[PDB]
Design a protein around this ligand. Structure first.
Ligand SMILES: [Zn+2]
Length: 518
């Protein structure tokens, strides 16, 4: 295993990075690039376990509500500034400051006074996080969270250089030269919708461990172009979907499958801007959930190890107090049936006072997402005779803004867990939660969801049954959204590229331990 001369890793992504502002990032792509150009207090190691990163150690109080983090004196930002505990004070106050309008403010609510800060009841200075020293960060929690060292390894908890963010203002995080880096790599040559480079950060304290000199990224939206780039040696890595999986499936040196605790689904928006949509109809939402044969979607279109899913909480995310997987236990979801779909759609005509309906289907502009869109559109139109579904392709940045603004009717999207617990899928759909984005509201659901939260440390077992009935109320009774599949990424990786880590929680990839052999 001899090191090569060129420590260069070439890949593609099929979207432009939405933003490099840590406080406003909502998505797995920004998380990937931030998770390689920043460093939180902790990071996930090669087997997804939280280890000291920007902190060199941490202590946990008797009652589990106070944390003390000890930082590295030699840690520096890419502009030469020392990484201080005040960078953690600033970043966390900025994520929660109402004026920031951060859609991920909620992931910091475990911090003391965080939700009061985000509501605007107390000033940001009351946030349960203090810089006693340049190298000592103490953090007070509302209550004990056993996976808190995991949460500080999540990108929304990454630090920020206040002086740099204040100087760049509203340009902060939109450009590679308007972002500053405390991670293993720096972001350079960020050509919007084209590509960007990760270069080894010479100002990083653990630069001795980083072997890659650069990771090159191109935006490529067509799987056929990705297979050509890989075969010609232009790139070292490619996801595989559809017919393109068949060619590589048998190659034990290069082919892998990433089995992701992650699900894709159709969002049903009940209120577009401030006007009701046909999706207010419980019978229409039921009819859309019954009309999609998911077996043909995953076995022919995806073709990559993805499993059909009637459930939202993915299999292998978390296990209960008896060690049984959450999704194997409850097996929640509506089972598709074309005939039940028709009969529920007949009922839906009376609820709405219409026999013909036009719903806009919001979709990614990538090659395999088009085929998924056309399949679902053909399934709904075929089984709900009189429904017109108009597909709208959008790039990811623009698609995420339409969703957060609720300027859509139905949307195809996916959720990657923020933590190894079903609440990361379920909490989204409580009334007025940041990521509902479909004006779905059920008082029955909100009560059960928030009961499960204080209960984890007290009555963990009752909580497990509570969340199972809550997903049941959400999928089968209310039919708030339509799950499609549990994701599994097919890929090829060149044999000479070693040590690349796939994670269950974002950042999805770490490259700091990756190296190239000959
Ligand atoms: Zn290579």
């Amino acid at each position: 295993e001899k090191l090569a001369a060129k420590q260069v890793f070439n890949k593609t992504e099929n979207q432009e990075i939405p933003t490099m502002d840590t406080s406003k990032s909502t998505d797995t792509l920004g998380s990937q690039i931030l998770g390689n150009t920043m460093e939180g207090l902790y990071r996930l190691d090669k087997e997804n376990k939280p280890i000291p990163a920007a902190a060199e150690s941490s202590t946990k109080s008797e009652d589990g509500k106070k944390y003390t983090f000890k930082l590295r004196k030699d840690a520096k930002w890419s502009n030469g500034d020392s990484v201080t505990a005040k960078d953690f004070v600033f970043a966390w106050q900025r994520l929660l400051d109402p004026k920031t309008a951060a859609e991920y403010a909620f992931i910091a609510f475990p911090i003391k006074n965080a939700e009061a800060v985000n509501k605007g009841e107390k000033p940001v200075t009351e946030l349960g996080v203090k810089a006693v020293d340049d190298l000592t960060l103490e953090v007070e929690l509302e209550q004990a969270v056993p996976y808190f060292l995991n949460l500080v390894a999540f990108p929304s908890y990454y630090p920020l250089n206040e002086k740099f963010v204040k100087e760049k203002g509203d340009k902060y995080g939109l450009e590679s030269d308007t972002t500053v880096y405390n991670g293993p790599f720096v972001l350079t040559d960020w050509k919007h919708e084209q590509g960007w480079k990760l270069k080894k950060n010479d100002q990083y304290w653990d630069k001795k461990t980083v072997k890659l000199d650069e990771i090159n990224y191109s935006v490529v939206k067509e799987p056929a172009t990705n297979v050509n780039l890989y075969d010609s040696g232009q790139i070292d890595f490619s996801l595989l979907t559809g017919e393109f999986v068949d060619k590589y499936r048998n190659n034990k040196e290069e082919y892998g499958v990433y089995n992701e605790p992650s699900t894709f689904f159709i969002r049903l928006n009940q209120k577009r801007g401030g006007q009701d949509t046909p999706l207010k109809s419980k019978k229409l939402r039921e009819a859309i959930a019954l009309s999609i044969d998911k077996k043909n979607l995953t076995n022919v279109i995806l073709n990559d190890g993805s499993k059909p899913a009637d459930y939202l909480v993915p299999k292998g995310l978390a296990a209960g107090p008896d060690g049984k997987d959450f999704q194997e236990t409850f097996k929640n979801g509506v089972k598709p049936d074309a005939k039940k779909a028709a009969a529920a759609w007949e009922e839906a005509k009376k609820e709405l006072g219409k026999d013909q309906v036009t719903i806009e289907f919001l979709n990614y502009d990538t090659g395999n997402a088009k085929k998924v869109g056309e399949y679902v559109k053909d399934q709904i139109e075929k089984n709900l005779k009189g429904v017109t579904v108009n597909i709208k392709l959008q790039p990811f940045k623009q698609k995420l803004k339409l969703e957060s603004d609720q300027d859509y009717d139905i949307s195809y999207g996916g959720w990657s867990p923020d933590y190894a617990d079903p609440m990361t899928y379920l909490d989204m759909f409580e009334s007025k939660h940041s990521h509902n984005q479909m004006s779905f509201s059920d008082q029955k659901y909100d009560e059960i969801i928030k009961k499960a939260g204080g209960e984890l440390m007290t009555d963990a077992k009752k909580r497990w049954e509570e969340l199972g009935k809550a997903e049941e109320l959400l999928l089968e009774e209310d039919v708030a959204l339509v799950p499609l599949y549990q994701s599994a990424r097919s890929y090829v990786m060149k044999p000479h590229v070693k040590g690349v880590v796939k994670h269950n929680i974002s950042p999805e990839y770490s490259y700091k331990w990756a190296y190239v052999t000959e």
